[PDB]
Design a protein around this ligand. Structure first.
Ligand code: HEM
Ligand code: HEM
Lengths: 158, 158
């Protein structure tokens, strides 16, 4: 069924209630991702040097994660809104990968994120099998390129 | 006049001859921008540490601007592609301003950059008045949120 264009629409809709901004509610969506991420996937807190043991409250009243939650949420809207333009989509992912090499992540998490993120959108407002499948379509596309680039950069890949 | 969808389309089309990628051709599309930048706006070389006196040959033989070129070009691609979504656009502008805090730039250069970009586009190939005015409408929005963000961030602004 799913072509480049249809995936986008789907993904963008999922996020239309989780819009980025400068206001309290806009800052909440950002912060809330890490609250959920840290609660249910606490073993990945390692990469977050110093936040490696943060409880849901520590993140809630933090400014590091009000900055970092706003950055991740703005990244995820970016992926949804440019997916239609393949070469640029692949471009952005390569940049994501580069700015992540410093933490030297486990090269399977590039898939895992969308479990967390769909699991986060499924935790805040609403979702569906069509939307969640599009995110996974974007994920396969993300990881598809993410590995190609990891093996291209002489780096740990699967 | 002209609208968000109209701008998007014109701004994107003008960029198909300067696409991002891993091949030799794509990598120079970012590189040639700096070769242009430095050859026509030398007084702005001050920002690029170590590269304040660099030439076209210096930039060409540099693997630093190969990295750095793809980044600015990608950034401008994402700008053209997400323009239809205003909040995601505003978000990416605030983020761009954030990532430029360290250089403490002349706040007037946020408008000025697009003059340079269309300048580059015309040096490379085809760029019509509609394509040029579209970028100029896009820039007038980028800059608008630039100064707004810097204002409520306690940093200098025009
Ligand atoms: C699920 C696997 C991931 C892990 C373990 C991870 C981990 C991290 C960590 C530890 C940081 C730095 C936080 C700090 O020290 O303050 C970071 C930054 C960041 N991450 Fe991720 N991340 C993951 C997935 C992603 C994905 C898929 C995206 C793209 C949508 C992304 C986008 C970003 C952005 C935009 C930043 C900060 C700004 C930048 O470096 O450009 N992350 N990440
Ligand atoms: C004439 C105005 C501008 C100047 C003088 C300028 C200057 C710089 C400098 C000094 C760097 C550091 C890179 C290095 O040292 O190798 C940089 C990186 C970068 N610039 Fe700009 N910039 C300008 C406008 C813009 C605009 C409008 C954008 C938005 C598309 C942008 C996007 C970026 C990006 C994405 C990077 C890569 C590093 C990062 O993301 O933090 N720049 N720029």
């Amino acid at each position: 069924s799913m072509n480049r264009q249809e995936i986008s629409d789907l993904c963008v809709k999922s996020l239309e209630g989780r819009m980025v901004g400068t206001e309290a509610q806009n800052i909440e969506n950002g912060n809330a991702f890490y609250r959920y991420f840290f609660t249910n996937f606490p073993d990945l807190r390692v990469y977050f040097k110093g936040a490696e043991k943060y409880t849901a409250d520590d993140v809630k009243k933090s400014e590091r994660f009000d900055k970092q939650g706003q950055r991740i949420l703005l990244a995820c809207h970016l992926l949804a809104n440019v997916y239609t333009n393949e070469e640029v989509f692949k471009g952005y992912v390569r940049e994501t990968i580069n700015r992540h090499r410093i933490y030297k992540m486990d090269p399977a998490l590039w898939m895992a994120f969308f479990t967390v993120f769909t699991g986060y959108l499924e935790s805040v407002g609403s979702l569906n099998d069509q939307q969640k499948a599009a995110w996974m379509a974007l994920g396969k596309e993300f990881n598809a390129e993410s590995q190609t680039h990891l093996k291209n950069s002489n780096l740990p890949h699967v």
